[PDB]
């Protein structure tokens, strides 16, 4: 019989932080029959995990491809990173049981044409789908591949990492500690300060009670930074830089609209021969991809690459996740299970 | 008989612009006996051409070695680049008639001990021996090794060379245009325009008389940016980027002592995927400098290489070289001719 196709609805434009209700609504007014509906030669798929991850800088945007974020419908689903499984097949591309990550909407079920904007997942090591949307999926593959483009390491170099504890960074600070360097990290928590400790953080420190410069004049000079809130902390690793530093941009904090903040000693890229790079995973994503999919999941399996996520469940409390996402109330990378895989 | 050896001493600090005959003096109370000086093993050397290069960032400072640029000592003679002959030797290392570039004190006359900062030069097309403080000098290896290391070219991308005119810059159009690219060039003066054109850029322009942001939109994007400057253009440059940009910073603008103007849109720099690679030239030289050295004077003699320099005959004109230097009023690279060659 019909089951209730449940989907998170962009209902109206928000002004300051989204308000679970109004700017989302969960809908249940749609329903699906799984055995029957027609899928015109396409395929059945069932939503198990959906990301929320945060946006700042272009508004309430879907997450990037083809270097266009695209905005919400009002009256249709909002659309993320997600993990689904194949219920029902009239595609030769794909069969009942196969896991599928990419692009979802926020919905419990949707019938595709076709695999655009879906990938195949090999989990060879049966771990959990969620980790496919976290530290094997965009967070993870941001710090994997960046890492592997540009940092060029030398054994016992020294690396500031910023908004350590984070998806991004505590994978690079892993990355790091595998390549012999001294890691430097910082955030903004005890909590955070414990697990960049954990994953092997030399020196951890939160910068709201600790002086990033004074820690960067104890311990570096710094060989590599990496950059995930531009600003403050990008004037600082410049000013603690050493000869031949490469600073790998990934992010910087901005608002809607604002971009980011100054660079108010930028000579010192001159001064001390810095290589300055930044980049967008989905422009190197192909020349990595096949390796991080394969290396990543046993490295997981074994334990040796720490992850945290912090789960909520069920498709009706996304709206409140993304807001606690924007306020930075999530204690780990946000996770929506959707559904269970059986 | 004895020979005056003129030298020019810095003889007080300057609050502002040097002022010639208080900044420093000719002074001719030094003579030297040409055949009998004795040389101790060393050898007795002529000064031939002398570089007068800006100073700003750091203050009154010779020229940058081992990354230490050091101040003038009062009473004492100032010092930079040059080219010498050597008269008379005691040392196995060098022979009359041999010719020497590197740094040296503004006298007529100076005995060595050795070869310490000081290098053969290799002349075969008999070129003017002041071609090696500009083209074949340091300017023209700031221009030639950064361009080696960091521009990878292809076939049609567009430069935007800042201060397009001048010693560097103008040798930059030269090797882009050598590499089949479309060059923008900007200067502040018709004249330097006129040469930027002789040398082959596409679009040359006045920045004082023309919208330097008007210009980039017109003519790019902007796959490779020569940065001379620093500030407002290459802010300019960054909001004109193509993605995958190169962005090699040479110099930027500034006082004594303030660095360096901000850069308030870096966020391009991560948008755009761009690679921003500062560099000094001593740090790199040893990479280019015997391809450098072979290859060059052959581009100069043939005419391919065109280059621009500012004569002023007379050691005791040096301190009024300077001054017109600071002041931007020499018409190319500013050279002292000190003394002919036989």
Known sequence: A??????????????????????????????????????????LLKTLELSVDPYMRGGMRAPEKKSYSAPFTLGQPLRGYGVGVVLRSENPQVKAGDHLYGFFEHTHYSIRKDLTGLQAIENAYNLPWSVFIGVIGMPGKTAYMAWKEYAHPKQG???????????????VIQLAKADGLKVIASAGSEE??????????????????????????????????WDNVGGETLEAALNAANVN?????????????????????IFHVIGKSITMTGFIVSRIEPKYSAEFYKEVPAKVASGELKYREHVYNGLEKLGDVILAVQKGENKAKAVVHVADDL
Chains 1, 2 share one sequence.
Do not use: H, W
Request: proline letters at 7%.
């Open 2 to 43: 019909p089951v209730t196709n449940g989907r998170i609805i962009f209902n109206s434009i928000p002004t300051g932080f989204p308000v679970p209700g109004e700017t989302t609504i969960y809908d249940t007014t749609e329903t699906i029959d799984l055995d029957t509906a027609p899928l015109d030669g396409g395929f």
């Open 245 to 265: 530093a490469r600073f790998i941009e990934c992010g910087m904090i901005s608002g809607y609209n604002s971009g980011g903040a100054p660079v108010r000693n």
């Open 192 to 225: 955070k300060v414990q697990f960049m400790k954990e994953v092997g953080a030399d020196v951890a420190f939160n910068y709201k009670t600790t002086n990033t410069a004074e820690v960067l004049e104890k311990e570096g000079p710094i060989d590599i930074y």
């Open 157 to 171: 170099e020294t690396v500031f990492v910023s908004t350590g504890a984070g998806p991004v960074g505590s994978f």
